[PDB]
Each structure stands twice: as C-alpha cells, then as structure tokens.
Design a protein around this ligand. Structure first.
Ligand SMILES: CCC1=C(C)/C(=C/C2=NC(=C\c3[nH]c(/C=C4\NC(=O)[C@H](C)[C@H]4CC)c(C)c3CCC(=O)O)/C(CCC(=O)O)=C2C)NC1=O
Ligand SMILES: CCC1=C(C)/C(=C/C2=NC(=C\c3[nH]c(/C=C4\NC(=O)[C@H](C)[C@H]4CC)c(C)c3CCC(=O)O)/C(CCC(=O)O)=C2C)NC1=O
Ligand SMILES: CCC1=C(C)/C(=C/C2=NC(=C\c3[nH]c(/C=C4\NC(=O)[C@H](C)[C@H]4CC)c(C)c3CCC(=O)O)/C(CCC(=O)O)=C2C)NC1=O
Ligand SMILES: CCC1=C(C)/C(=C/C2=NC(=C\c3[nH]c(/C=C4\NC(=O)[C@H](C)[C@H]4CC)c(C)c3CCC(=O)O)/C(CCC(=O)O)=C2C)NC1=O
Ligand SMILES: CCC1=C(C)/C(=C/C2=NC(=C\c3[nH]c(/C=C4\NC(=O)[C@H](C)[C@H]4CC)c(C)c3CCC(=O)O)/C(CCC(=O)O)=C2C)NC1=O
Ligand SMILES: CCC1=C(C)/C(=C/C2=NC(=C\c3[nH]c(/C=C4\NC(=O)[C@H](C)[C@H]4CC)c(C)c3CCC(=O)O)/C(CCC(=O)O)=C2C)NC1=O
Ligand SMILES: CCC1=C(C)/C(=C/C2=NC(=C\c3[nH]c(/C=C4\NC(=O)[C@H](C)[C@H]4CC)c(C)c3CCC(=O)O)/C(CCC(=O)O)=C2C)NC1=O
Ligand SMILES: CCC1=C(C)/C(=C/C2=NC(=C\c3[nH]c(/C=C4\NC(=O)[C@H](C)[C@H]4CC)c(C)c3CCC(=O)O)/C(CCC(=O)O)=C2C)NC1=O
Lengths: 50, 160, 65, 49, 159, 47, 160, 160, 159, 159, 160, 160, 159
C-alpha cells in the first residue's frame, strides 16, 4: 500500500564555484586585473589611484 | 542550473541584490566562456573517436569482453558504448554550464541503483570514465582538460 | 457530444516497415472536450483533416449536452 | 473513464500514488522527474481523473 | 540561456549544435551591456517604485479605495514591496538573458496566489507597465528597448 | 518594546510603506447611483 | 468507508446479524446526518475564504513567506494553498462519512514521506491545519465544529 | 514553413542553386526581421487586452451574447475568447515566419467544417477578426500592422 | 532555424521565449555572411564536383572497378550528379542556418535507398568528405569552418 | 564651517553664538550651489588639469628643461598628478566651506617636502594659478569668484 | 570632525573624489542642519534649567546627596553640576557636527579612568544623563530630541 | 584533518612530492598560526560570556522562551546553552586547525536529522549562531573574526 | 602535531591546555626550517635513492642474488621505488612535525605486507638507514639531526 516513489528529493552538489579551476583562475586573474596600471587614459590620472 | 543561475539563486534566497562578489563570479564565467565554447566544439567533433580510444585503452582485451564478462553479448557492448557516450555528452553539458547540477539531476540520480540491479561492474566503469578523461584532456589541451576532468571525476566519484 | 472524423497522418520521420495502414487513415468518433487536443495532435503531424461530422449532439442546446 | 477503474485504483490509493499507478498503466513507465509530478498533481487538483 | 540550450540539446541525444554555440558566444559578447543595464536598474530602484506607485494609483484608484486590497499604509507598503520584487526579478532576467529565472520565481503560479489574496492581476500588470515606462525614461534607447523586453514579458505574463 | 528592537528582516512590507505615503492617492469616492433607480432592463444597449 | 459500512463490516466479520447496539449506532448516525449535511454545505460555500483566513492567521508575514522560507517561491505558495484546500476538502468528506478511514486511505498514507522528502516544514503545516480548524469552527458553529475539528486534528496528529 | 524555407524549397525542386533573385528575397527578409521581431514582442505583450478590445468593439452588446445567440452560454463565451486568442497567436507566428503556410496547415485546415458543424456564425467571426486586425494595427503601428493585417485577412478570407 | 524555434515553442503552449528571439536576431545578423558563403559555393560547383570525383576515385577504386556500381560513363555521370545534389543540399543548409531543409531532402531515408540501389554508403560519405576538403581549400578560414559544419553533418548522416 | 565654529566656541567657555548660527544657516543655504560647483569640477578633471599644466609649461619651461625636475614622461606624469591632487583638495574646500581639509591634507608641511624633493615651490604655485584661471573660465562668473578664491588660498599658502 | 569631514576622509582613504553618493549624504546633512541650528538655539536658551530639572528629577533626595555619599560636599555638588553642564554642551556640539567622534575624543578619552580613580559612581551618572535626555526631548521636540538623545546615549554608553 | 594534513593528503593521492605550491600553502599556514593561537586563547577565555551575550541578543524575550516555544522548559534552556557551547567550541577547533573537516565529521554529520526529529527550530539556531559570530568577531577583532565567522557560517550553512 | 593535541584534549572533556598551545606556537615558529629541510630533500630525491641502493646492495647482496626478491631489473626497479616511497613519507613527516601521517601510510601494516611479499624487513631497514646516511651527508648538522629524527623513526618501525 505504501507509495513507491513519493517525490524526488533534491540533492545538493559537492562543487559550487570554488573549483572549476579556470573559472576560479579567472576570479583571481581578473581581481588582480583591476590593480595593474590600466593604460588607456592619460598617465597622470593613473599615478594618483590608491 | 548554470553558474549564472546558481549565482542568481544564491543572491535571491537571501533577498540580496547583486553585490560585487557575485559580479566577480559572473565576470569570471564570462572570461572563461571562450575556452568553454571552443572545448565543447572540439569535443562534439570526435566523440565517437574518444569513446573508441577509451574502450581500446581500458575495457578491450580484458575478461570483460570475454564470455562471462559483462560486455560479452553484443547488445551489452552496444549498451556500454551508449553509457560512455552519455557520460561524455553530459560532461560536455556540465562543462559548458560551468555547474555540475545537471550531472546530479540527469545522470547521477538513480544510477548506482541501476548498476547494482543489472550487475554492472562499477570499478570498470570508473576506469573507463578515467580513460575518457585522459583521452579528452589530451585532445582538448590541459587548460580545458582540467575543467573536463573535474566533471568526469564528479561522475566517477558519485558512481563510486 | 461526439464527432465523426476522417483523418490522415504523414509519418514523415521514419520508414515504417509494418502494416501501419489504420493510422494513416481512420474514421473514428471522438468526444466533445477530447476532439480539441485531437485536432491539435493531428495538426502536429501535418495531417490532412478530410471531414468533420456531427455524430452525437444537437448544436445550440445549452443544458444536458 | 469507467467507474470500475475509479474503484480499483483511485479509491484505495492517494493522490500522490495514483500518478505513478496511472503512468505505469498507460504510458508504461514511472514519471520522470518532479515537474512531471507537479503538472499531473495540478490536473488532479482542479480537475477530475 | 545556457541552461536552455543545454536541456534543449539534452532532451535529444545529440551534442550542442554549433549554432547554439554561436548564440552562446553572442550572449557572452552582449553580457557587458546586460550588466550595465542591470546595475543602472539596480541603483535607482526606489525612484522606479515611487514612479510606478505614482502612475498606478493615478491610473487605478480602487486599490486606494477602501474596498480594494491596498487600503491603508500597511497594505500600500506591501503593494510597493510587490513592485520591488518584480523589479528585482526583471533585473535577474536582464542578466540571465532569457526569462527562465524570472518566470520560475514570479510567473509560474502567480494567478492562483493573487486570486487567493483577493488582489486583481490587471492592476499588477499596470504596475509593471508603469515600471517599464519609468525605466524607459531612465535609460537610453537601446537600453530601454532591452529592458522593456523583459518588462513586456512580465506584463504579458500577469495577464 | 523588544519586538521592535530586533531588526526588520530583508524583504519586509514596512520598507515600502514610506513610499506608499509619499505617493498618497486616496481612492475614489462612491458614485452614489442607486441600484433601485438604474432600470437595468432598459439601460442595457444593443451593440 | 462509512460509519454505516464500518458497522456493517464489524457485524459481518463475526457472522453476526444486526444486533441492537449496531442499530443504535446507525440510528445515532441517522440523527446526526442533518447537521452533517448542513455543515458540509456551508463549508463548501466559502472554502477559499477559509484557506485565505487561515494563511493570514498562521503563515503570512512570517519567515516562511520571506526568502529562505519554504513558501517564498510563488509556485510554492500555490502548492501551499493546494495542500490546505486538500486538507479542508478531505476533512469535509470524513465529516460527512462520519468515519476517518478516507483520511487514512487518501491523505495520510504516504504524506510524511513526501513532506520529509521535499523538506516541507511539518510544524508550520500543523499550525496551519489548526488555524483552518479554528476558522471553520467559528464559521460553522460549535456543534459541527467539534466534528470538523476531530478530523482536522486527526490529520494533524497523523502528520506529526 | 518559412520564407527562407520556401525560397530554399523553390530553389530545390528545380535543382537550381541559389541565384541572385533568391538572395534578394532572403536579404529582404533579413531586412524586415527587425520590425518583425519588435512587432511580435509587443503583440505578445498584451494579447488579452487586444482580444478584450476586439470583443468590446464587435461582439459585445449584440444579440450574439443575448440568449439565442451563439455566445450566450458562458462556456461558449470562453470558447469564443479561446478562438480569438488562437487567431491572434497563429497570426503572430505567420507574421514572424513571413509565410502564411502555418495558417494553412494548423488553423485553416478543417475549420469551416467545424464551424458549420457547431453552427458557429461565420460572418461574426470575420468581423471579430477584422476588429482584432484594427486593434493590433493601431497598437503596433502602420508599418507592421500591414503585415499583421495580411495574415489576419488571410484567416478571414479562408474562413469565408 | 525560425521553424525550429516556432515548432519548439509551439509544442508548448507558451510563446517564443526571448532567448529564442535573441538567437533569431543573431541569425538575422549572420545571414549576410551565410549568403556570401552560399554564393561562393554556388558559382564554383563544377570545380567541387571535379575535385570530389578526383579524391574519391583516388581513394576508392571499386566504384571504378566493374564489380562496383559506378562503372562506365553513364554510372559515373550519375555518381557525379549525386555529388552535385549533395552540394546543392549543403548550400540550402548553409542558407537556412539549421540542418532541417537538407535532412528533409537528403538524409531521412537515404540508407534504404542506397541499399536498394546497390551502392555503398561509405563511398558517398567519402565523396562528401572530398567535397568538404575542396570547399575548405576554396574558402577562407571562417568560411571553411562554417561550410565544414554542414558538410560534417552530411558525412555523419551518411554513415 | 561647523568644525571651526565648534572649536572656536570650544576655546571659550560659551555656546555657539547667534552670529555663528547665522553663518551655519547661510552655509547650508549656499551648500547646494557649492555641490553644483563640485559637480562641474569633478566632471572637468581631465581637461582642467592638462590645460593648467600646459599653461605652466608655457610660463615656466625650467621644470621641463633637462636640468629641471619634471624632465621625462614619468616625472611630468607625476607633475600632472600633483596638480590633480591640488584640484581635488580645492573641490573638498569648496564643499566644506572651511580650508581645514585643504590645509591638513596638502598645505601644512608642503614647503619642507618640496625642499627635500628638489622641486621649486613657485612653479607648483604657478600651476595652481593656472588651475584657477582655467576653472574660472569654465564656471559661471560669481561662481568662479567662489572657486577661484579657494584656489587663491591654495596659491597664497603654497608660496 | 564633522559629518562633512567624515565624508571627505572616507573618500580620501578610498582615494577618489566626491561623486553622487557622498553628495547625497551632504544634501541630507544640509537638510537636517536647519533644524539642528534651531535646536542649538533652544538648547542654549535654558541649559541651566535643563541641568536643574535633571538633578531635581534624578539625583536629589537620595543616598549620594546625603551624608555618606559622593555628592554630599559642596565642592562635589558643584563638580556634579559642571559635569552635567559639560555633557549637555558637548552633546550640543556633537549634535551640530552630526558626528560623535569629536565628543568621544573630547570626554570619553579619560573620563572612565577619572571616575574610576575618584570613586564616582557610574550608574548614577547614567541616570543623570538619561534625565538630561528626557528633559531635552521634552523641551526641544521629537526628532531633534532624539538627535540629542543619540549623542547623550553615546556618552552614557561610553561611561559604562 | 588539518590544513597541513590536507596539503599532505592532496600531495599524497597523486604520488607527488611536495612541490612549491604546497610549500606556499604550508608557509601561509605557518604565518597565520600566530593570530590563530591568540584568537583561540581569548575565545577560550570567556566562552560563557559569549554564549550569554548571544542568547541575550537573539533568543531571549522572544516567544521561544515563552511557553509553547522550544526553550520554555528549563532542561531545554540548558540543552540550548549546551548546543551553543558546542558550536563555539568546534568552531574554535576548526579555526585552529585551519580546515573545516572536523565540523563536517563531528558536528554537521547527522545534525539536521536530530533537529528535525526533536522539532528544534532551525532558523532560530541559525540566528543564534549569527549572534555568536557577531559577538566573537567584536571580541577577537576583525582579522581573526573573519576566520571565526567563516567556520561559524559553515555551521550555519550546513545546518540550513 | 595539531591533530595530536586536538584528539589528546578531545578524549578529555577539557579544552586545549595552554602548554599545548605553547608547543603549537613553537611548531608554528619552526615550520619555516621544516619547509626548507623538506624542499632540500625534495629536489635531490634521485641522488638519495641512488646512494641508498648503492649502500644497500653493497651491504646486503642477497637481494641481488637470484634467491632474493630484488633479482633482475624489474625487481630492482620496484626496490628503488619502495625506497622512493619511504623518502616521500619521510618528507611528509618532516613537514607534519609528528610521525602520524607517515606511520598511517607506511608503518602500521608493513610487516605482514612484506611477509606476504617474500621480502625481508631488515633489508628495508638497512635501506632507510642508507637514506639517512645520504641525507646526513646532504644536509647541514642541525638539518641532518632533524631529518635523522624521522628516518630513525622509520628504521625503528621497520624492525
Ligand atoms: C491529498 C493529500 C495530499 C497532499 C497534502 C499532497 C502534497 C504535496 N505537496 C507538495 C509540495 C509542496 N507542499 C508545500 C506545502 C507546505 N510547505 C510549507 O511551507 C507549508 C508548511 C505547507 C503548506 C501549508 C509546498 C510549499 C510545496 C512546494 C515544493 C515544491 O514544489 O518545490 C507535493 C509535490 C508536488 C506537487 O505539489 O504538485 C505534493 C505531492 N499530495 C497529496 O496527495
Ligand atoms: C517575488 C515573488 C513574490 C510575489 C509575486 C509575492 C506576492 C505577495 N503579495 C502579497 C500581498 C499583497 N499584494 C498586494 C498587491 C497589490 N496591490 C494592489 O492593489 C495591486 C493589485 C498589487 C500591487 C500593485 C496587496 C494589496 C497585498 C496585501 C494583501 C493582504 O494583506 O491580504 C503576499 C502576502 C504578504 C507577504 O508575505 O508579502 C505575497 C506573498 N511574494 C513574492 O515573494
Ligand atoms: C487553431 C485554430 C482552431 C479553432 C478556431 C478551433 C475552434 C473550435 N471552436 C469550437 C467551439 C466554439 N467556437 C465558438 C466561437 C465563436 N462563435 C461565435 O459566436 C463567434 C462568432 C466565434 C468566436 C469569435 C463558440 C461560441 C463555441 C462553443 C460551441 C460549444 O462548445 O458549445 C470547437 C469545439 C470544441 C471546443 O472549443 O473546445 C473548436 C474545435 N479549433 C482550432 O484548432
Ligand atoms: C537530392 C536527393 C537525392 C539523392 C541522394 C538521390 C540518389 C540517387 N542515386 C541514384 C543512382 C546512383 N547513385 C550512385 C552513387 C554513387 N556512386 C558511387 O559509387 C558512390 C557509392 C555514390 C556517389 C559517389 C550510382 C553509381 C548510381 C547508379 C546506380 C544504378 O544505375 O543502379 C538514383 C537513381 C537514378 C536517378 O534517378 O538519378 C537516385 C534517385 N537522388 C536524389 O534526388
Ligand atoms: C595631496 C597632497 C600631496 C602632494 C602635493 C604630493 C606630491 C608628491 N610629488 C611627488 C613628486 C614630484 N612632484 C613633482 C612636481 C612638480 N613639477 C614641477 O616642477 C612643479 C613645480 C610641480 C608640479 C606642481 C615632480 C617633478 C616630481 C617627481 C620628483 C621625483 O620623482 O623625484 C611625490 C613623490 C612621488 C609620488 O608619490 O607621487 C609626492 C608624494 N603628494 C601628496 O599627497
Ligand atoms: C569636559 C570633559 C570633562 C569632564 C566631564 C571632566 C570631569 C571631572 N570630574 C571630576 C570630579 C568629580 N566628578 C563628580 C561627579 C559625580 N558625582 C556623582 O555622584 C555623579 C555620579 C557625578 C555627577 C553627576 C564628583 C562628585 C567629583 C569630585 C570628587 C572629589 O571630591 O574628588 C574631575 C576631577 C577634578 C574636579 O573637577 O574636581 C574631573 C577632571 N573633566 C573634563 O575635562
Ligand atoms: C556537537 C554537535 C551536536 C549538537 C548541536 C547536538 C544537539 C542535540 N540537541 C538536543 C536537544 C535540544 N537542542 C535544543 C536547541 C535548540 N532549540 C532551540 O529552540 C534553539 C533554536 C536551539 C538552541 C540554540 C533544545 C531546546 C533541546 C531540548 C529538546 C529536549 O531535550 O526535550 C539533543 C537531544 C538530547 C540531548 O540534548 O542531550 C541533541 C543530541 N548533539 C551534538 O552532538
Ligand atoms: C608508500 C607505502 C607503500 C609500501 C611500503 C609499498 C610496498 C610494496 N612493495 C612491493 C614490491 C617489492 N618490494 C620489494 C622490496 C625490496 N627490495 C628488497 O630486496 C628489499 C627487501 C626491499 C627494498 C630495498 C621487492 C623486491 C618487490 C617486488 C617483489 C615481487 O615482485 O614479488 C609491492 C608490490 C608491487 C607494487 O605494486 O609496487 C608493494 C605494494 N607500497 C606502498 O604503496
């Protein structure tokens, strides 16, 4: 009488985004892309950025 | 699910707007999508050659294709090729999505139940998925072969 | 309220090697709220609908079907 | 449609179990994922069997 | 839009066909404009909810009227919170590029929810139309077109 | 006093409450036409 | 099953004819059927108002309808309204039958399995059924509200 | 079929390669696809408002919604709204395809048979499709309203 | 590719989801490159059939051999006419952007046709591979990739 | 002007004077116009700095002479960055109404600093005077009196 | 320091200029600065009456003002008056600055160790500061009263 | 497991010697161990004060300690203090190890099973762990409070 | 060594006693010397296996003799691979500071493994002694002492 398949239990993954290691290499490479001199606009505005 | 959809969901269940860490995650995904698409194209090129090379590496000339083994009957050999093509195709989908949830939802759901019901050997399947991973990491390069091997090892680890 | 329909199905996707004669052409009765999705399914296969006829039902009657 | 089948499978069994017992008979196989249970449960919700 | 093509090619036994790879590459190219549009709608939210409540309560005064649902400060605050929710889902759909993660959270069961809450759905559709008009005034032409896309989907969905 | 001091949770109805006050717009008044004097059988127009 | 059918079954499995105690049970059922039918009519009047008042009493403005709660998504709110309408409708059927066996056969069979599979909170469901019971006992009167609350508390006790 | 698929078919049944006239046809289609997509989006916006305005223009307050008319019963009013939504939706599909073959294949196939079987008035349907065409030509503009009215008049002409 | 999305959204009761509208807009953008590739394969047909017959009869000489099917001038003319047909269907698939109007005319029943004609299908696949190689030599890199797409579909289909 | 008024009433034992409260009221009333001037100077950062530096090199060619300090691309980039810093401090002083942000960020020890750097003070001062002239030409007239008088404090305090 | 100098210092640690977020903070500060000026006048009106009402409400007729208490002696009573006069004056300064850091740096630097070493009770000072808060909230108004009370409670929390 | 033991294990299962990236990981751990030990000492100082402040922040004066709540009975209040002391102690162990595996092995193993069996509210527990995290991040400083909050948020995320 | 103190204080209900915190702080201080010793043993591995095989096969020639186990190139390659494994575990124990992650992988069941492989354990102990002698020649005095520590543990364990 008991129900054979009641529902489908949602199962969680064991990798979220910290792996996949050039999505993860991209997190890093691009986070460090911001603070390297970005030469597109005049140079005098780019020595005065903390 | 995606990596985009996972980021949106993780921001949604808190009621949080898109903060800078989520924008970092999405921009990293938008950086890696180039090699993701190129890898998916060249894996879709020669999937049959990858499966052929993988069974020639791991499963052929063993006792598994001899009588008594699970790949002796020719319908069972065809079912073996079908299962390996499934593993490679869904690993391609999980590589292009950047999120292994479709492997958990469509492949790894009731698969150990089926493989213990039919008497399918699990360790030979794990070694075949390993040979698949080595062949496609050689074929696509190391840089996309890492992400391909992550989801193929995800299938191998959930299978065991 | 039933309809008498004569219809044809193309079977374009595969080269069937069996009899498969009934399916291509048939004359069947279908009930009232069922002919809707039957219409739609027959049009999904590009099927020709030859003739739709009333079997059961007086049109314009409101209670009692 | 017949009230026989209504008395064999709908009456002793719940609304959750009748979806699997109804797709075993007609479609020949269990329901595939959760959304295919959700749509059939809504059809058993505001409409009859 | 990647999940759409993936489950689309996944129902089939085939791989992702390279036309789908072309559409993924084009979406990857347009993602920067998508992110700028989403941030522009993000930082200016309270203006959009204010002007949406403005245009809605000018258009339909029955929610203001005591027979309607949004009568009193608490009910009108819940009303503007609903409009805030729909603006948030519109920004999600702007980033995702396809209307799946917004329909999954705001559309798929909304008619019976608003029916068993007593509120009319046409007033909610007029509220999302007011949000679309205010965001059309806030953005440039090629940005307002691409925002009115998903706003248009919500307006068609609530009806 | 200890229910107000925690913190209103994200996605509350109170945050948008202030905005509602700003928009104002009390709803419209009653029409005043009575259902006894409508003469609905004659008042309905064809086409 | 009925109360009539339960009395007939209990007399049948002994091979017993209808003795005077069974006739007392059937005549008590035939006395109470008046208010049973009137209660079922006025509960069928405004079931949507009862469910609306019950969620406004118990579930609304909590963390359950906030993000992170189980009623956050709008399909989950619609599923909540569906489950409460089911509880009220099957409690109406069990009230008019005068026997809770249809609750055991059609509702309470595999329900804890489903609610622990989906992660549905059980205590909030019990409090929602309690608010349903209070609203319909106010709406129908005390004399039929007792019999309505018996089967609603039966659903609540079997759920826990 | 498409306009693209019709051009390819007309070039195929001759065994002809793609000559310059077919390339002109495809490039004209690729020019007009902009307003085709924009028109389809804004028609998908408010289809219910278009159907409501069309029945308020043509069918309401007539004898058709009075008793004796074909739209008196409320299931027949719902069927009327369904048929008008079908006409608008398939006209949207034929507008975006740029080829009326889907109207011939999916709508206009056995429709006069059905409307003469049920006793549905044909002239009132034609006037309702005309009111649909006027409302959507006002709503979308003249430049896309011409192409919308072409397929709506195609449905009206095949219906008669 | 528009019929694909239309019947795809037509099996469902939903409209065309705007991600599908994005893929239609992107195909509409790429249609000019598609038309140039199709015209370049159009005007140079007899070169491609010549080099395909070259590479095929160098690769498989059994069709030349009298036990094979393509023996004699009439049979070899029918063979090059078949290769001409497949090049024509490849140009149709290049314009249409998706492989439906080429599979509908050349793929869907080809195995039983070539089986009841006596010809082997692998030689036809090698002929379409030779057509792909000759068109890869004829076109630029981004054009040969997009032509070898549909040529690759035909080669996979004939096997 | 609030900090200076508070510390001035702090040196005495008494509260804030009615005169000083009138000063704070007038400063609040002019604060919106000061934010407009800060808006214009923020958005004209590039061309103001470049025109002022090139006016300086027009007046004083000793710094860009090879015996001078600002010889080379990197040195002249740091020169323009110094002018950028001083324009930023001028905007801070226009907003605050005090000159205490200008003073304790960039005035108080600048003579000993530029003595140890080898840089002439008067050329810095001439560059800030060029900034004063450029921002005077950009703004409205008595608004330019307001901006140029803070510039005048910086110029007189550098020398 | 002010709220203005706090905004400037926060933007200076970032190294950027004053764009729209900082400008909106400054517009907010200007809009409250009008009523802040009016409250400064109405506080400097009757500071002596405020301290008198506060000590009469809180400190008088207790054990600390009796023989054997901290406020028994005449010089100790005068020190109490001047300390409460200070707390009112520096809360006025911190109200007009819109920033409590000047108040903290002025008195909360060493008053903890001073009241530790002298044996001054802390809780009686907290009660006296709360009485000042009530008297000024009754005298000035609602929103300027709570603006005063924010910095007075900052003093009372710094002493504790 | 450790961070050292995790690095050694990750180098071991490949058969790899200790390459320079693993030496970087170990040297980063040997750099951070100073503040790790100092943070663990001052958290071991006043754990009872942290738990007291956390229940006074989050759980006290709610309905949870009222009758009907889960912390009404005094043995249930003592069990609440025990569970919060467990969370703080195992978060201290995971902070000093630099690896959250002991939380997965000793705390988060069968904890949702227990809390859904007993009817323990999960959201109030998450809030209480959040208040624990805020109190110890205030008490230890920001620089070690980040690493303490990482493992406390790990417990909170695994609990949900 | 942190897991040792943690399970040591974990069997008790007490916290980590601060003498254990002192030993963890001292190990944290010495970790840099540990890492340098491990890298010096890391990069020079093949020298150490060569000199260990040298000194072992000079000391015990029965593994070379055909009755012994390490007869032939394949068996002697497996022998030097075993010595490579033990050098790797010694580097793990040098980093970890305590002999748990090396005993868990190389010691805890080694006697029955080498008994059911046929090899004598005393020859393996002499091989690790030769590794200790070669690493003592490779390192400085305070480094060779701290390496001969864990090498000494392995030599005592294999006996
Ligand atoms: C006739 C007896 C009967 C019941 C009760 C029943 C329940 C039932 N409730 C479900 C889901 C659900 N049930 C709930 C209900 C709740 N969650 C809460 O937070 C509240 C405490 C409670 C509402 C009062 C929710 C929110 C879902 C949505 C889960 C999901 O679909 O993602 C599902 C999964 C599929 C679907 O709804 O269509 C079933 C089968 N089926 C039955 O045959
Ligand atoms: C993100 C997906 C999502 C949706 C769509 C949503 C709707 C939603 N709207 C609600 C109430 C409400 N919604 C409205 C709506 C309106 N005011 C009107 O007059 C118009 C018809 C309309 C908006 C302009 C009103 C007036 C209430 C309060 C009704 C009541 O208290 O009964 C409530 C119950 C109270 C609450 O918990 O907020 C929910 C759950 N919640 C969600 O999480
Ligand atoms: C996609 C193309 C398509 C169409 C149009 C279609 C029409 C269609 N209209 C029907 C009925 C109907 N159709 C109408 C429509 C009308 N009568 C009037 O007076 C008006 C002039 C007109 C509305 C504008 C009405 C009133 C009925 C109800 C008859 C009945 O069910 O009793 C029926 C009978 C069963 C059912 O509705 O569910 C079909 C199949 N099916 C299709 O597949
Ligand atoms: C556009 C879709 C389409 C296809 C695919 C097609 C195939 C086709 N190939 C045919 C013959 C043929 N096809 C070939 C084929 C080949 N030569 C070889 O050796 C290779 C195996 C292969 C090509 C390189 C040969 C040799 C014949 C003549 C066979 C005979 O006369 O029996 C014929 C019968 C004669 C004719 O009417 O042309 C048809 C219909 N016709 C079509 O309309
Ligand atoms: C916000 C307040 C502030 C000021 C003013 C400031 C100036 C400043 N000017 C510098 C260099 C310099 N400054 C100049 C300046 C000039 N060239 C001339 O002849 C002109 C008179 C003058 C342009 C106004 C030059 C040429 C150098 C480079 C000198 C060197 O590199 O040795 C340096 C060292 C390099 C650097 O860190 O950029 C500082 C810190 N820093 C500050 O934080
Ligand atoms: C301007 C910032 C500032 C403050 C506030 C300040 C306070 C201050 N309060 C003092 C004493 C004192 N403070 C008090 C205060 C109190 N006794 C009580 O019972 C109450 C709790 C509290 C009065 C409300 C008393 C009684 C003394 C004198 C104790 C003695 O005889 O030594 C002293 C020691 C010297 C003296 O004034 O006699 C200082 C320096 N100094 C400063 O620079
Ligand atoms: C090391 C990891 C670990 C945990 C956490 C653990 C928890 C745990 N908590 C329990 C009970 C409990 N746990 C709680 C805790 C709470 N209820 C609330 O309302 C609050 C939200 C929350 C406190 C913050 C309460 C109130 C009980 C009492 C139930 C009862 O015993 O009747 C029980 C039942 C038996 C017993 O306490 O002695 C266990 C095993 N065991 C473990 O080994
Ligand atoms: C890291 C932990 C670990 C240990 C300890 C280990 C030992 C180990 N030694 C083996 C063989 C062997 N081991 C030796 C050992 C020696 N030569 C001698 O004469 C001396 C007695 C000694 C070394 C100097 C020999 C000769 C064989 C081959 C024996 C055979 O083939 O039967 C084998 C079987 C072949 C293989 O799969 O490598 C294992 C598993 N494996 C491990 O994974």
């Amino acid at each position: 009488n008991d129900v054979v398949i009641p529902s489908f239990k949602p199962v969680q993954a064991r990798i979220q985004s910290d792996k996949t290691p050039i999505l993860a290499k991209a997190i890093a490479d691009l986070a460090a892309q911001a603070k390297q001199m970005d030469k597109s606009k005049p140079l005098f505005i780019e020595l005065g950025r903390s | 699910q995606d990596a985009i959809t996972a980021v949106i969901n993780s921001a949604d269940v808190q009621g949080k707007y898109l903060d800078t860490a989520a924008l970092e995650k999405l921009k990293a995904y938008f950086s890696t999508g180039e090699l993701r698409v190129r890898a998916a194209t060249t894996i879709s090129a020669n999937a049959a050659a990858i499966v052929k090379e993988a069974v020639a590496k791991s499963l052929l000339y063993s006792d598994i294709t001899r009588p008594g083994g699970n790949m002796y009957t020719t319908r069972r050999y065809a079912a073996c090729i079908r299962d390996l093509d499934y593993y490679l195709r869904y690993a391609t989908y999980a590589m292009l999505a950047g999120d292994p949830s479709i492997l958990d939802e469509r492949v790894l759901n009731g698969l150990k139940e089926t493989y213990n019901s039919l008497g399918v050997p699990v360790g030979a399947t794990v070694q075949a998925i390993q040979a698949i991973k080595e062949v496609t990491a050689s074929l696509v390069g190391a840089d996309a072969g890492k992400e391909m091997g992550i989801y193929l090892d995800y299938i191998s680890s959930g299978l065991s | 309220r039933l309809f008498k329909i004569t219809a044809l199905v193309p079977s374009l996707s595969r080269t069937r090697t069996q009899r498969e004669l009934q399916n291509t052409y048939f004359t069947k009765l279908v009930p009232y709220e069922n002919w809707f999705r039957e219409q739609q399914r027959i049009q999904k296969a590009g099927g020709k609908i030859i003739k739709v006829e009333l079997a059961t039902g007086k049109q314009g009657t409101n209670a009692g079907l | 449609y017949s009230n026989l089948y209504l008395k064999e499978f709908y009456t002793p069994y719940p609304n959750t179990k009748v979806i699997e017992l109804g797709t075993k008979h007609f479609l020949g196989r269990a329901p595939i994922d959760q959304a295919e249970i959700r749509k059939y449960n809504q059809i058993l919700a505001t409409q009859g069997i | 839009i990647v999940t759409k093509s993936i489950v689309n090619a996944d129902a089939e036994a085939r791989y992702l066909s390279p036309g789908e790879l072309d559409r993924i590459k084009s979406f990857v190219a347009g993602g920067q404009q998508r992110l700028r549009i989403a941030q522009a709608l993000t930082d200016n939210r309270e203006r959009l909810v204010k002007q949406a409540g403005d245009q809605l309560f000018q258009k339909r005064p029955d929610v203001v009227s005591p027979g309607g649902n949004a009568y009193g400060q608490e009910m009108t605050a819940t009303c503007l919170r609903d409009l805030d929710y729909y603006l948030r889902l519109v920004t999600y759909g702007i980033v995702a590029g396809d209307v799946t993660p917004i329909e999954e959270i705001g559309v798929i069961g909304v008619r019976e929810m608003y029916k068993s809450l007593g509120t009319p759905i046409e007033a909610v559709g007029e509220g999302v139309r007011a949000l679309k008009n205010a965001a059309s005034t806030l953005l440039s032409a090629e940005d307002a077109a691409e925002a009115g896309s998903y706003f248009d989907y919500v307006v068609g969905a609530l009806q | 006093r200890k229910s107000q001091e925690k913190q209103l949770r994200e996605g509350d109805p109170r945050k948008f409450a202030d905005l509602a006050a700003s928009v104002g717009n009390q709803g419209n008044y009653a029409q005043r036409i009575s259902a006894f004097d409508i003469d609905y059988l004659n008042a309905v127009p064809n086409r």
